[PDB]
Amino acid sequence: ILNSTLSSPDIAGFCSGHHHEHLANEGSLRCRTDWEQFIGPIERWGSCNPWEGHFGAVVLPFCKPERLAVICYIFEYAFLYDNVVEYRTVRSILGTKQIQSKMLLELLSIDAPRAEVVINSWKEMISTTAAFNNLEEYVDYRIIDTGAPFVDMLMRFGMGIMLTQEEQKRIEPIVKPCYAALGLANDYFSFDIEWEEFQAESDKTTMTNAVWLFMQWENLNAEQAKRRVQEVTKQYEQQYLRNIADFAAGEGKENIKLQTYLKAQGYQVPGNVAWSLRCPRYHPWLCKEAASLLHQDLGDEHLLGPAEYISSLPSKGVREAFIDGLNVWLVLPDHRVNQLKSIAQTLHNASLMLDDIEDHSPLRRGRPSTHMIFGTEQTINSANFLLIDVMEKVRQLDDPRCMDIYLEEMRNLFIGQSFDLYWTRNGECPSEEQYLDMIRQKTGGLFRLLTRMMVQIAPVQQKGLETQLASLSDVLGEFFQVRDDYKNLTLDECKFSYPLIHALTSQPKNVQLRGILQQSRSAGGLDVPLKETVLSHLRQAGSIEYTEAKMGELMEKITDSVVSLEGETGSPNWVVRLLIHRLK
Amino acid sequence: LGDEHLLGPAEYISSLPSKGVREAFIDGLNVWLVLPDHRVNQLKSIAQTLHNASLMLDDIEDHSPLRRGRPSTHMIFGTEQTINSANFLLIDVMEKVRQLDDPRCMDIYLEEMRNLFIGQSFDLYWTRNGECPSEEQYLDMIRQKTGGLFRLLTRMMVQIAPVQQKGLETQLASLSDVLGEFFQVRDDYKNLTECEDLDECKFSYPLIHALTSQPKNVQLRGILQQSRSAGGLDVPLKETVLSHLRQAGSIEYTEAKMGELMEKITDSVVSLEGETGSPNWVVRLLIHRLK
Amino acid sequence: EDLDECKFSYPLIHALTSQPKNVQLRGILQQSRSAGGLDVPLKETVLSHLRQAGSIEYTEAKMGELMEKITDSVVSLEGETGSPNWVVRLLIHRLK
């Protein structure tokens, strides 16, 4: 039911084929006031056209009045949005953002369905915008460069109707006359000014416009450049009705909606034609009387809990005693010495707490493990928070760059433990060199962190020898890992270890060993006497002998690096000598 | 030796599509504060990274094989490897924080990532041991767990921004606490209306109103115990639970606090707008989008 | 069912042979062993990683090149025997 109640041909050689006013007119006006508020000063006459129709006045008088005011807001906005597309800089982005959201808030206020396609079409049109040969390829350029699909979807929003894609492909050739018309029809009048702007566009490439190409494509100047447009548009309008007659003879014999929708889509071509004839937007001189007309117109426990248990178990006390030794070489105040020992004790408890979960270890030190009294996940939280509690203490000891050292020896710490976990789930034997670098940056990483923090916040003069202590920490981090593997063999997770790499690198025909390992990774844990066999093979191939060739080589390089420090710095330290002896 | 098996879990959780809730909110607070554009993107990486560390851990404690469709990280890369890379993303974040060029920004970060972890500790009690919480303890657990990533972004965003503006933190922080309630309560309501809401024996808002009032419903406290023994109820069982909560009216008492939360959120935006005097339509594009 | 026990097939071998750093593929084929059954959501993911790495494209080559060797060899046997085998072509044709 098209309402002509409020909706009131040879144009320039071609073209053979709203009463709410202020509700629409002022609705457009609000846009200009709002846009100047946010974006920038008002400019070239908008969709208004006092005599031949303020866009929607003639272009779409059939839009439902209630949405039309917002559609006129859109009509102005779509114009205004293009009108400029045709601290302050970020505010301009901010100025964009807000008034950008003003439409959606208002547009989604009326209804969802029609907006959906319209929303999708709108950004699609903009995306399409961002050597002419024939007429049709520029039509493909300007079918969506006019915004017409979005506009006729906005016209489909005009009466708030949808065009299903099956019918769309059906009407795609049916509306192709009009779809291609909006291309050619728009240029004709726009060209008259666009080429005036084109003649001022200087840097212009081949000017994207049907008409101006026609002056020089085949040297059919103006009246003949019109004539091909006339040959297009006078036909394209007759052809529109001719195809609408074909539509009337075919798809739209009594097709109700698309018949009334092509009726509105039939006033589209005359609506832009009537609009383009005498608009101040296109003829600025009218602006003054046009403007003159407008002048007339919840606790603490349950998080610290798991940390209390693992910090109250019988400890060996190695990491805590390494700092006790180096301090004699390094000399730092007692207040700052206990601080680091608290950091070392906390961080070490974080590593062990995540261990038993990541190696199924049901007990440690002979007592129940920490993931059996508080749960598997409540333990992970406590670990992920102790990593934050250490950072609060790192700041506390006064230094700006002591934290960057912590943030580096913790990336290296985690980089190595990732590799170990790979080699144990996706069973894969690492090489001897690749195993030595993993235990280098996963056990010695904590020793490095305690070393490079002490050698940085010490009362100066202990910076030249920094490298040497980093060598001790690196050569000693290895020692613990290659000494634990013998203390642990004299595998319940079948963890690849230093003796075991030698076994499966010296006999690549020891089928039995691969089969006491794979039975351990599958059933879960080697059973009691099957471990007896695994010791036997390692005894028949060296391994046990070889591990004391590296426990010795390491034990000679530790004593070599200790000697250098003592002599180079005079003071003979004896805490480290006692610690080294008890380690043997 | 290399650096691939650590960042591996991070890349996978980043890949899967998302919503943009954390991202859009920062743009909403952007036009009340006039931040530069160089700092905001640096501020937006902390939101993506920290929310990703949350997800990888949360799936571990749910045993949910899939997130949104595509599989979870703890089923492609292993629980042990996904926990390790999760703790690395935390340390990675505290590198971006000191790249923001401010001393007390770090203090803010390690003050609201401790309240973000007390809330989770409580939430993991009430599911492993099976203790029905109180209605007010629960409403305090969510303002810290899911409303803690919001306060952390807010207070940081007002400390980095050009100072000028007075103690806007007072009203702006209060917005974050209430917005975290409208998000968790919504997630609970849009589970028992069509699920995995009860497959973890997870206590939600409907389930703490039907369990305190009607305190002799021996049927419900029997199907909430089968969950802890079978690792999740079956489809017919939940239709019994869902019909059980209707009689208690919990589905009706959840939609009553949701309206209050949307009223207190609306009021705060209006009151803080009358102060600044610059209508932030972006926050209203959000507000209608969650109704 | 081939991935249900992770029976190494031609496409899977080429995918792992080509990319040494497709950590995801290594991970899923371990989930297969650790649990016992590759679920459907994971099984769809495996197929995608092959296509992005080709693999399936490589399969057609051998599966078509093998057709070259047999077709050429059968003609050779056809000539020397002096008796046209039409029943081996039927088994061949009903196999394509």
> What is the per-residue DSSP string for B231-281?
TS--HHHHHHHHHHHHHHTHHHHHHHHHHHHHHHHHHHHHHHHHHH----H
The interface residues of chain B toward chain A in range 62-81, judged by CB-CB distance below 8 A, are 78, 80-81
Say if the Cβ atoms of A101 and B141 lie within 8 Å.
no
As a whole number of angstroms, the distance between CA A33 and CA A99 comes to 11
Question: Is residue C38 a contact partner of residue C31, using CB atoms and an 8 Å limit?
Answer: yes
The Cα angle at residue B10 between residues B5 and B13, in degrees rounded to 5: 130
Q: Which two tokens stand for residue B171?
A: 């009203």
- The helix-helix angle for B169-189 and B148-160 (nearest 10°) equals 150
How distant is the Cα of C28 from the closest Cα of chain A, in angstroms? Answer: 10
Question: Is residue A79 a contact partner of residue A136, using CB atoms and an 8 Å limit?
Answer: no
Residue A149's CB is within 10 A of a number of other CB atoms, namely 23
Query: In C, which residues are within 8 Å of A522 by CB distance?
Result: 33
How many inter-chain contacts (A to C, CB under 8 Å) are there? 6
Q: Where are the beta strands (DSSP E) in chain C?
A: none
Residue whose C-alpha is closest to residue A13's, from A143, A183, A185: A185
Residue A14, classed as helix, strand or coil, is: strand
Residue A519 makes CB contacts below 8 A (sequence gap 6+) with: A526, A530
The interface residues of chain B toward chain A in range 144-163, judged by CB-CB distance below 8 A, are 144
Nearest neighbour of C31 by CB, restricted to B66, B69, B76:
B76
Query: In B, which residues are within 8 Å of A401 by CB distance?
Result: none
C-interface mutation test, from B70, B75, B80, B85, most C Cβ less than 10 A away: B75
How distant is the Cα of A360 from the closest Cα of chain C, in angstroms? Answer: 15
Query: In C, which residues are within 8 Å of A418 by CB distance?
Result: none
Nearest neighbour of A377 by CB, restricted to B5, B124, B140:
B124
Name subunits touching C (3+ CB pairs < 8 A): A, B
B93 touches chain A (CB under 8 A): no
Residue A368, classed as helix, strand or coil, is: strand
Q: Look at the block and give the residue holding tokens 């990274």.
A: B49
From residue A37, give the alpha-carbon distance in Å to each of A23, A94, B146, B272, B278.
21, 12, 37, 20, 11
Q: Which two tokens stand for residue A480?
A: 């613990």
As a whole number of angstroms, the distance between CA A61 and CA A3 comes to 9
Burial of B138 (0-12, 13-18, 19+ CB in 10 A): buried
Residue A394, classed as helix, strand or coil, is: helix
- The helix-helix angle for A444-457 and A411-425 (nearest 10°) equals 180
Name subunits touching B (3+ CB pairs < 8 A): A, C
Q: Which two tokens stand for residue A321?
A: 């005693």
Residue whose C-alpha is closest to residue A403's, from B103, B61, B261: B103
Residue B200, classed as helix, strand or coil, is: coil
Query: In C, which residues are within 8 Å of B12 by CB distance?
Result: 24
Q: Where are the beta strands (DSSP E) in B6-93?
A: none
Torsion of CA A497, A503, A505, A510, to 10 degrees: -130
Mark out the alpha helices in A280-332 (DSSP H runs): 287-296, 305-310, 319-330
Question: Is residue A240 a contact partner of residue A234, using CB atoms and an 8 Å limit?
Answer: no
How distant is the Cα of A305 from the closest Cα of chain B, in angstroms? Answer: 10
Say if the Cβ atoms of C27 and B65 lie within 8 Å.
no
The Cα angle at residue A187 between residues A183 and A193, in degrees rounded to 5: 155
Q: Which two tokens stand for residue B276?
A: 């600044």
Say if the Cβ atoms of C23 and B75 lie within 8 Å.
no
Q: Look at the alpha carbons of A36, A39, A42, A48 in this order and tell me if their dihedral is positive or negative.
A: negative
As a whole number of angstroms, the distance between CA B19 and CA A166 comes to 31
Percentages helix, strand, coil for chain B, rounded to the nearest 5? 70, 0, 30
Say if the Cβ atoms of A90 and B113 lie within 8 Å.
no
From residue C56, give the alpha-carbon distance in Å to each of C48, C60, C63.
10, 7, 11
From residue A194, give the alpha-carbon distance in Å to each of A190, A209, A283, A288.
5, 8, 12, 21
Q: Which two tokens stand for residue A561?
A: 């690096």
DSSP state letter for B114 = T
Q: Exposed e or buried b for every residue in A398-436, given b needs 16+ CB within 10 A?
A: eeeebbebbbbbbbbbbbbbbbbbbbbbbbeebeeeebb
Residue A264, classed as helix, strand or coil, is: helix
Question: Is residue A385 a contact partner of residue B112, using CB atoms and an 8 Å limit?
Answer: no
Say if the Cβ atoms of B65 and C31 lie within 8 Å.
no
Please list the residues that pair with B71 across neighbouring strands: B66
Residue-by-residue DSSP string for A425-484: HTT-PPPHHHHHHHTTTTTHHHHHHHHHHHHHHSSSS-STTHHHHHHHHHHHHHHHHHHH
Residue-by-residue DSSP string for A41-92: ---S--S--TTT--GGGTSSTTS-HHHHHHHHHHHHHHHHHHHHH--HHHHH
Closest C-chain CA to A422: C27
Q: Which two tokens stand for residue A307?
A: 């940390």
Say if the Cβ atoms of A522 and C27 lie within 8 Å.
no
C27 touches chain B (CB under 8 A): yes
Q: Look at the alpha carbons of A384, A386, A391, A392 in this order and tell me if their dihedral is positive or negative.
A: positive
Say if the Cβ atoms of A391 and B36 lie within 8 Å.
no
As a whole number of angstroms, the distance between CA A277 and CA A270 comes to 10
Query: In B, which residues are within 8 Å of C48 by CB distance?
Result: none
DSSP state letter for A7 = -
As a whole number of angstroms, the distance between CA A158 and CA A69 comes to 11
Say if the Cβ atoms of A87 and B37 lie within 8 Å.
no
As a whole number of angstroms, the distance between CA A398 and CA A388 comes to 18
Please list the residues that pair with A300 across neighbouring strands: none
Residue-by-residue DSSP string for A408-424: HHTHHHHHHHHHHHHHH
A-interface mutation test, from B285, B288, B289, most A Cβ less than 10 A away: B285
Residue B165's CB is within 10 A of a number of other CB atoms, namely 15
R_g (Cα) of chain C, nearest Å: 19
As a whole number of angstroms, the distance between CA C42 and CA C34 comes to 14
Name subunits touching A (3+ CB pairs < 8 A): B, C
Closest B-chain CA to A434: B1
Q: Which two tokens stand for residue A402?
A: 């002591």
R_g (Cα) of chain B, nearest Å: 20
C84 touches chain A (CB under 8 A): no
Question: Is residue A84 a contact partner of residue A126, using CB atoms and an 8 Å limit?
Answer: no
Q: Exposed e or buried b for every residue in A473-496, given b needs 16+ CB within 10 A?
A: bbbbbbbbbbbebeeebebeebeb
Amino acid at A228: R
Q: Exposed e or buried b for every residue in A174-205, given b needs 16+ CB within 10 A?
A: bbbbbbbbbbbbbbbbbbeebbeeeeeeeeee
Residue A362 makes CB contacts below 8 A (sequence gap 6+) with: A356, A368, A369, A372
Q: Look at the block and give the residue holding tokens 């060993």.
A: A513
Residue A507 makes CB contacts below 8 A (sequence gap 6+) with: A513, A541
Euclidean distance between the first and the last CA atom of chain A, given in angstroms as a whole number: 100
Query: In B, which residues are within 8 Å of C42 by CB distance?
Result: 71, 75-76
Q: Look at the alpha carbons of A417, A419, A422, A428 in this order and tell me if their dihedral is positive or negative.
A: negative
Q: How far is CA A73 from the centre of its chain?
A: 33
As a whole number of angstroms, the distance between CA B209 and CA B188 comes to 13
Which method was used? cryo-EM
As a whole number of angstroms, the distance between CA B227 and CA B229 comes to 5
Ligand-binding annotation for A88, yes or no, is: no
Query: In C, which residues are within 8 Å of B69 by CB distance?
Result: 41
B231 touches chain A (CB under 8 A): no
Q: Whats the size of chain A, residue-wise?
A: 584
Burial of B58 (0-12, 13-18, 19+ CB in 10 A): middle
Amino acid at A431: S
C56 touches chain B (CB under 8 A): no
Question: Is residue A402 a contact partner of residue A456, using CB atoms and an 8 Å limit?
Answer: yes
Say if the Cβ atoms of A388 and B98 lie within 8 Å.
no
C33 touches chain A (CB under 8 A): yes
Burial of A218 (0-12, 13-18, 19+ CB in 10 A): exposed
Question: Is residue A228 a contact partner of residue A139, using CB atoms and an 8 Å limit?
Answer: no
The DSSP bridge pattern shows strands A367-368 and A363-364 to be: antiparallel
How distant is the Cα of C59 from the closest Cα of chain B, in angstroms? Answer: 26
Residue-by-residue DSSP string for A214-258: HHHHS---THHHHHHHHHHHHHHHHHHHHHHHHHHHTTTSS-THH
Question: Is residue B123 a contact partner of residue B62, using CB atoms and an 8 Å limit?
Answer: no
Q: Which two tokens stand for residue C38?
A: 């590759």
A289 touches chain B (CB under 8 A): no
As a whole number of angstroms, the distance between CA A238 and CA A265 comes to 14
Ligand-binding annotation for B74, yes or no, is: no
Q: Which two tokens stand for residue C20?
A: 């040494």
Say if the Cβ atoms of A425 and C33 lie within 8 Å.
no
Residue B209 makes CB contacts below 8 A (sequence gap 6+) with: B135, B248, B249, B250, B253, B254
As a whole number of angstroms, the distance between CA B212 and CA B207 comes to 9
B114 touches chain C (CB under 8 A): no
A428 touches chain C (CB under 8 A): no
Residue whose C-alpha is closest to residue A356's, from A369, A373, A344: A369
A434 touches chain B (CB under 8 A): yes
A332 touches chain B (CB under 8 A): no
Conformation bin of residue B63: beta by default, left when phi > 0, alpha when psi is -120 to 50 = left
Residue A149 makes CB contacts below 8 A (sequence gap 6+) with: A121, A125, A143, A179
Residue whose C-alpha is closest to residue A125's, from A159, A158, A153: A153
Residue whose C-alpha is closest to residue A158's, from A6, A299, A341: A6
Q: Look at the block and give the residue holding tokens 């832009």.
A: A272
Question: Is residue C34 a contact partner of residue C67, using CB atoms and an 8 Å limit?
Answer: no
A522 touches chain C (CB under 8 A): yes
As a whole number of angstroms, the distance between CA B163 and CA B158 comes to 8
As a whole number of angstroms, the distance between CA A391 and CA A347 comes to 10
Residue A364, classed as helix, strand or coil, is: strand
As a whole number of angstroms, the distance between CA B21 and CA B182 comes to 13
C21 touches chain A (CB under 8 A): no
Query: In A, which residues are within 8 Å of B31 by CB distance?
Result: 94, 97-98
Q: Exposed e or buried b for every residue in C40-72, given b needs 16+ CB within 10 A?
A: eebeebbeebbeebebeebeeeeeeeeeeeeee
Say if the Cβ atoms of C27 and B76 lie within 8 Å.
yes
Closest C-chain CA to B6: C23
Residue whose C-alpha is closest to residue A419's, from A409, A434, A406: A434
B20 touches chain C (CB under 8 A): no
- The helix-helix angle for A319-330 and A575-583 (nearest 10°) equals 150
C45 touches chain B (CB under 8 A): yes
Ligand-binding annotation for B284, yes or no, is: no
User: Resolution of the coordinates in A?
Assistant: 3.6
Say if the Cβ atoms of A426 and C30 lie within 8 Å.
yes
Identify residues after which chain A is interrupted (C–N over 2.5 A).
8, 17, 86, 130, 297, 490
How distant is the Cα of B125 from the closest Cα of chain A, in angstroms? Answer: 8
